[PDB]
Amino acid sequence: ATYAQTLQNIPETNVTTLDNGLRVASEESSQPTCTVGVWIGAGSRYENEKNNGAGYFVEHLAFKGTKKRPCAAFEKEVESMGAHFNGYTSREQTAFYIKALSKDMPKVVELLADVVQNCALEESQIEKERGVILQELKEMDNDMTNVTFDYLHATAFQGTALARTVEGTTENIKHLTRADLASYIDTHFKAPRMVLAAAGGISHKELVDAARQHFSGVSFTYKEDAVPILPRCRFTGSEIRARDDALPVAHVALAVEGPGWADPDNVVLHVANAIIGRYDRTFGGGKHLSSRLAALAVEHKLCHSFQTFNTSYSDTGLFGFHFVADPLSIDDMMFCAQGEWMRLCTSTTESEVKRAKNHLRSAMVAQLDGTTPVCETIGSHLLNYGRRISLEEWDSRISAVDARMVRDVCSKYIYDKCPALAAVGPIEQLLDYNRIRSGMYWI
Amino acid sequence: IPFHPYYSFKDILGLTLMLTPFLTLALFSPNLLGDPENFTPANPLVTPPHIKPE
Numbered sequence: 001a002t003y004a005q006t007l008q009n010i011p012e013t014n015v016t017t018l019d020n021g022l023r024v025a026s027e028e029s030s031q032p033t034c035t036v037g038v039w040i041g042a043g044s045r046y047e048n049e050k051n052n053g054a055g056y057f058v059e060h061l062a063f064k065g066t067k068k069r070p071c072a073a074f075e076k077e078v079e080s081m082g083a084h085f086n087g088y089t090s091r092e093q094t095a096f097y098i099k100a101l102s103k104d105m106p107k108v109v110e111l112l113a114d115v116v117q118n119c120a121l122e123e124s125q126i127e128k129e130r131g132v133i134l135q136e137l138k139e140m141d142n143d144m145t146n147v148t149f150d151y152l153h154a155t156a157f158q159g160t161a162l163a164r165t166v167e168g169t170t171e172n173i174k175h176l177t178r179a180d181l182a183s184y185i186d187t188h189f190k191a192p193r194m195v196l197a198a199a200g201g202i203s204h205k206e207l208v209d210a211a212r213q214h215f216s217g218v219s220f221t222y223k224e225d226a227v228p229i230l231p232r233c234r235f236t237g238s239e240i241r242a243r244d245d246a247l248p249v250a251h252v253a254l255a256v257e258g259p260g261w262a263d264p265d266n267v268v269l270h271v272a273n274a275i276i277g278r279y280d281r282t283f284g285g286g287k288h289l290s291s292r293l294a295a296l297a298v299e300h301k302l303c304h305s306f307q308t309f310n311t312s313y314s315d316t317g318l319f320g321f322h323f324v325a326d327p328l329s330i331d332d333m334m335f336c337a338q339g340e341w342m343r344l345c346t347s348t349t350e351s352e353v354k355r356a357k358n359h360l361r362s363a364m365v366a367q368l369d370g371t372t373p374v375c376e377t378i379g380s381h382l383l384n385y386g387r388r389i390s391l392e393e394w395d396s397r398i399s400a401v402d403a404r405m406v407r408d409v410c411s412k413y414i415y416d417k418c419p420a421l422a423a424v425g426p427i428e429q430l431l432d433y434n435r436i437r438s439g440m441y442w443i
Numbered sequence: 444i445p446f447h448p449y450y451s452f453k454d455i456l457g458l459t460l461m462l463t464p465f466l467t468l469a470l471f472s473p474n475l476l477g478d479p480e481n482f483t484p485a486n487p488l489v490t491p492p493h494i495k496p497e
């Protein structure tokens with residue numbers, strides 16, 4: 001059994017569309033346990049100034065009970081069957097999924113449908129969650145990494161929809177109405193914009209059957225079955241500096257505009273990010289790590305950690321890096337980090353990509369380690385590519401990448417571009433934008 | 444802020460701004476500031492009527 005053969009012998013992903021426009025996909029295995037859920041193409045980006053934080057507010061009630069079954073009843077039923085009910089809401093994507101015994105795939109599907117369609121939106125529960133959410137905002141306000149990424153979007157996409165955070169504003173949370181949440185749900189949780197995904201030991205035909213039975217409510221007009229294209233979010237080379245010398249370490253995030261899901265270049269960017277990789281003070285590897293930046297970080301004690309990223313979206317994305325450092329080592333870190341980015345565009349090696357490619361393969365294989373992670377892939381894939389992409393296709397694409405390709409693609413999105421910068425904490429040593437902007441050319 | 448490029452650029456600008464009058468004077472009015480008396484070889488026995496410094 002060779003890597004290739006194992007990739008080809010992986011069960012295919014089945015997809016079937018209902019008349020209402022919903023899509024049902026699943027990957028079959030021989031596991032007594034499974035995961036199934038509905039991936040909705042909704043999120044903060046779809047909200048506006050008045051209902052920002054609604055999709056999040058909803059994410060809080062999506063588990064507090066439906067019309068057919070109030071809170072206690074809803075919970076008991078799920079708990080008593082050993083099933084796990086989780087989910088999340090992001091900027092362009094939302095999800096509600098359940099982990100359970102394949103033996104219950106059908107009852108689950110019924111439960112899912114009931115959650116996405118008949119949420120009780122208990123008037124009293126709403127005021128109760130209003131206070132919970134407000135506490136979660138204070139908890140997250142201490143999460144530098146997330147404060148930093150929020151700020152990164154706040155400036156990189158200033159003036160637009162991606163600038164908003166997923167959780168929403170304090171004013172919105174304090175005044176969102178039972179009607180607003182309701183409106184949100186009806187406006188966005190719609191068949192053509194949803195995907196019923198499942199993985200494990202399940203019959204695609206049994207899945208699609210229960211699907212037909214519970215995901216009904218078809219649409220009449222044309223405006224109800226058309227998936228709205230969102231208005232473009234303008235990228236802006238800029239920076240937001242939130243200084244507080246009272247914080248122990250500083251977080252910095254720099255990024256250029258990314259291509260967006262459908263673009264093939266993304267395979268190259270991910271290889272590129274693989275070369276620079278990531279690091280943190282507990283990587284036993286130490287000073288021998290392959291990632292040059294990681295090596296320098298260790299030798300010069302440049303940071304506590306650093307990480308690259310290539311966040312995608314429908315029509316845009318953020319390609320960059322983030323690091324945490326002591327107030328006195330920020331400048332050298334940023335220096336080396338930008339240095340490496342220059343190296344990418346200019347002097348990438350075949351060896352470098354050979355390694356990065358292997359690293360990338362095992363990384364994609366890791367994101368399919370369990371029923372939930374695989375289910376997440378399916379949901380996301382159909383929702384972003386409108387079709388599942390096998391590990392064999394990815395590997396096909398990854399294999400085509402070479403040093404020259406990395407250089408051209410990287411030169412394309414990085415070289416001499418105006419980045420977006422977010423710095424939080426004791427950031428006095430971080431030099432100005434103009435200085436950083438110069439680190440964008442020559443290497 | 445870092446001296447470069449803020450003040451390196453500001454300084455180079457200030458340089459060319461003052462360099463114009465300097466060159467204009469030197470190239471269009473070379474003798475505006477000097478005493479015509481200095482175009483006459485020093486004479487130990489005759490002192491100029493109106494000795495005036497730069």
Ligand SMILES: C[C@@]1(c2ccc(Oc3ccccc3)cc2)OC(=O)N(Nc2ccccc2)C1=O
Binds near residue numbers: 494495496497
């Ligand atoms: C250019 C000049 C000059 C430059 C700097 C000076 O300042 C001082 C330098 C040393 C000692 C005292 C003053 C003074 C004169 O040199 C010079 O010979 N003169 N001419 C002059 C004419 C009449 C009286 C006194 C001087 C200057 O103006």
